[PDB]
Amino acid sequence: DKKQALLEAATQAIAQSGIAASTAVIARNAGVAEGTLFRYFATKDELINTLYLHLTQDWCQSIIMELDRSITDAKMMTRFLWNSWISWGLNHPARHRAIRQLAVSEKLTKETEQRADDMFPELRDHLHRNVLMVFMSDEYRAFGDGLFLALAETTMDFAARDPARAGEYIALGFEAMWRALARE
Amino acid sequence: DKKQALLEAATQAIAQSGIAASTAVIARNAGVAEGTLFRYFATKDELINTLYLHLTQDWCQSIIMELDRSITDAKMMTRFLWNSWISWGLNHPARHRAIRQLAVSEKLTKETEQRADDMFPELRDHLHRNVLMVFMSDEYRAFGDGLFLALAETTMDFAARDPARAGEYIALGFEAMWRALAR
Ligand SMILES: COc1cc2c(cc1OC)-c1c(OC)c(OC)cc3c1[C@H](C2)N(C)CC3
Ligand SMILES: COc1cc2c(cc1OC)-c1c(OC)c(OC)cc3c1[C@H](C2)N(C)CC3
Secondary structure, eight states, X not given: OHHHHHHHHHHHHHHHHGGGOOHHHHHHHTTSOHHHHHHHSSSHXXXXXXXXXXXXXXXXXXXXXXXXXXXXXXXXXXXXXXXXXXXXXXXXXXXXXXXXXXXXXXXXXXXXXXXXXXXXXXXXXXXXXXXXXXXXXXXTHHHHHHHHHHHHHHHHHHHHHXXXXXXXXXXXXXXXXXXXXXXX | OHHHXXXXXXXXXXXXXXXXXXXXXXXXXXXXXXXXXHHHSSSHHHHHHHHHHHHHHHXXXXXXXXXXXXXOOHHHHHHHHHHHHHHHHHHOHHHHHHHHHHHXXXXXXXXXXXXXXXXXXXXXXXXXXXXXXXXXXXXXXHHHHHHHHHHHHHHHHHHHHOGGGHHHHHHHHHHHXXXXXXX
C-alpha cells in the first residue's frame, strides 16, 4: 500500500527532522514521487494530521492489547500505562520521536484532537480523573502533553543507552512524571 | 578568532544536525580546512567537550548577571534561576539547542563535568541542597539533568510560539519541574 508506505516514510523523516521534514524526501523514501504524495495528502498539514492519527491508533491498540484489568489503584494503573508507553517507544523509537513532534504542533486540527482522544476513551477518562486540572484545560492541555512526552522520551533515551539500569530510569521517570502532572 | 569561528560554527552545526555533525562542515563554515580543526582540537570528542564549556560559560554568565541571592527562599531562588535559563534559551536558541544535546551526549569527560560545575559553584551548592538526592547521585545526575533539560526545552518551545501566555508556560513548567526534581 502506497498510503502506508508514505505514512511509514513520514514517520522516519519527521522523527529525524521534525515537522520541517520535506515532503520530497518523504515521497522518495516511500518509493513514490512528491506529486503522488500530494494526491494522497493534498496539503502537508493534511499529511501531518493523518500521520498523528495513524501513530495514535498504533500506540493505542498496542496499549489496549496489554491493559491489565486487575489493577484497581489509580497510581499503579498510571504506572502500568507509563510502563506500556515507555515499552512502545523503546520498541518503536521513530514512531515515538515523530509522535512527540506531531503532538506539540499547532498544525493539529480540532477534529484531529477529538479523534485522537476517542481512540482510547478509558485512558482519556482515567487522565481526566488523575491529572492536574490545569493540564486538562483548553489552554494548557497541549503543554501538559508536551511535558509528559518530554519526560517519557528522556526516560526512553536513558533506558535505551544504558539498558542495565533501564528499570530504574523508568521508575524514576514515572515518579518524577507523577508528581509533575498528577493530582497528589 | 579562528578558534571562536570554529566554536560558533560548531554551535550552529550541532544545533542543526546534532552531535554527529561532520567536522568537515564545521571547518568549512569557518573558512578553514578540516585538518586545521583537528589542529585546534585533538578529537571530535575534545571539540565537543570544549564547545560544552564555552556554551556553559555563556549561560552561567548570563544567569550570574541576573543573580540576586539576597533572596533566601529555596523555591523562589530556583524559580528565578529557572526563569533565567528559559530566558537564555529563548534568546539563544542555537546555543541552547547545541548545549542541550551535548549535556546528554555521554561524550563529556568528568574533568569537563566538574569544570562546568566550577563555572557556577553557588548553583551546584543550591542544587545539592534542594534537588532530590537520587538525582544528585553520580548514577542518576545525568538523567536528572536530562529531565530538567527536557522540561525546560518544552517550556521554551511553547513560550516562543505563544508569547501572550509565555510566562504561564514558564510558571507551569517551573512548578512541574520543581515537583519532579526538588526535595
Ligand atoms: C498531563 O498529564 C498526563 C498526560 C498524558 C498522559 C499522562 C499524564 O499523566 C499521568 C499519557 C498517558 O498516561 C500515562 C499514556 O498512557 C498510555 C499515554 C499518553 C499520554 C499523553 C497525555 N499523550 C497522549 C501521549 C500518550
Ligand atoms: C536534577 O535537578 C536539577 C538539575 C539541574 C538544574 C535544576 C534542577 O532542579 C532545580 C539546573 C538549574 O537550576 C534551576 C539551572 O538554573 C540556573 C540551570 C541548569 C540546570 C541543569 C541541572 N543543567 C546544568 C542545565 C543548566
